[model samples]
Target: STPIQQLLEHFLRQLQRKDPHGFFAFPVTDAIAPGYSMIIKHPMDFGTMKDKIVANEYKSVTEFKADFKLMCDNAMTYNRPDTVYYKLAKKILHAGFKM
Candidate 1:
C-alpha cells in the first residue's frame, strides 16, 4: 500500500481504539460546510439561522448515521460531478474516509 494509505490505516486504528464514541459526539450537518469551498459554491441570500440543537439529539446510532448521510447528499447535490469525485477520492485512498 502507499504511505498515504498506510498512514490512513494507522490513524483509523488509533481513532477506533482511542475514541470509538467520537463519531456519535460529532455534529452531522456542519461537517460538509463552508470548509469545503467547492461544496459551498456560489452563495446567494445566505442568512444564518440559529436554532436550538443538541449533539446527542438522535435516538439511535442508525438515526445519527442517516442524518450524517443526508448532509453529505445535500452537499454533493450542489456540484455533483466534482463533489462526487472529491468524496470518492477520499474513500478510494483512505479506509478512514468515513466518519
Candidate 2:
C-alpha cells in the first residue's frame, strides 16, 4: 500500500474512534432516517469512507477531509439543532478538526 493510503487509513480509524455511539459508522437509510436520501444530495459515512480508502479513490488528504465534512454537515443539516444527532455531529466535526 502507498504511504498516503496508509496514512489515510490511520486517520480514518482515529475519527471513527471518536464516534463510540456508531451514529456515523454507516449510511443513513431512508427507513432509519426519513427523507434522508431526498435531503442529503451527497451522502457520506464512515463505512463508505473506509471503502474509498480501500479502493484508493481518495487522491489527497483534502478529498478525505471534504468527505468527512460532508458526512458531518449532512447530519447537522438533516437533524434539528437541538437533537442529539446534530449535537454529536458538531462535536465530532470540531474534534476531527483538532486531529
Candidate 3:
C-alpha cells in the first residue's frame, strides 16, 4: 500500500479509539447519523485543501498527501485540533460507511 493508503488504514484503527469526552475526536452533532456523518463531513470541509483537490488543480495525490500528512502532523504537534489530514479521508470514511 502507498503511504497514504497506509495512513488511511491507521486512521480507521484510530477511529475506534476515543477521547475522554466519551466520543471520537470528530465529535457528534447530528441527531440521527451522528458520529459517522461528522467524521465524513469535516475532512471534505477542512481548510483549502479539499477545494483545491475538488477543482482538479492537484494532479498528484502524493503532493496532496504531503499536505494532508502535515495536517496530521500539526494535530499531533500541537493537539490544537482533534482531527487532521482529511482530503482522502472521505474516501476511507465512505468505504467504512458502505461496509
RMSD in Å for all candidates: 13.0, 0.8, 11.7
Query: What Cα-based lDDT does every candidate model obtain?
Result: 0.36, 0.93, 0.40
Q: Write the per-residue lDDT of candidate 3 for residues 1-99, one digit (tens) a residue.
A: 555544444543443332223222342345633454434433322334544544555556455555554434333333223343232343334443442
Q: Which candidate has the top score in TM-score?
A: 2
**What's the lDDT for candidate 3?**
0.40
Q: Which residue pairs clash in candidate 3?
A: none
Model 1, runs deviating above 4 Å: 1-55, 83-99
Which scores better on lDDT, 1 or 2?
2
Off by over 4 Å in 2: none
What is the total number of backbone clashes in candidate 1? 0
The C-alpha TM-scores of every prediction are 0.33, 0.95, 0.34
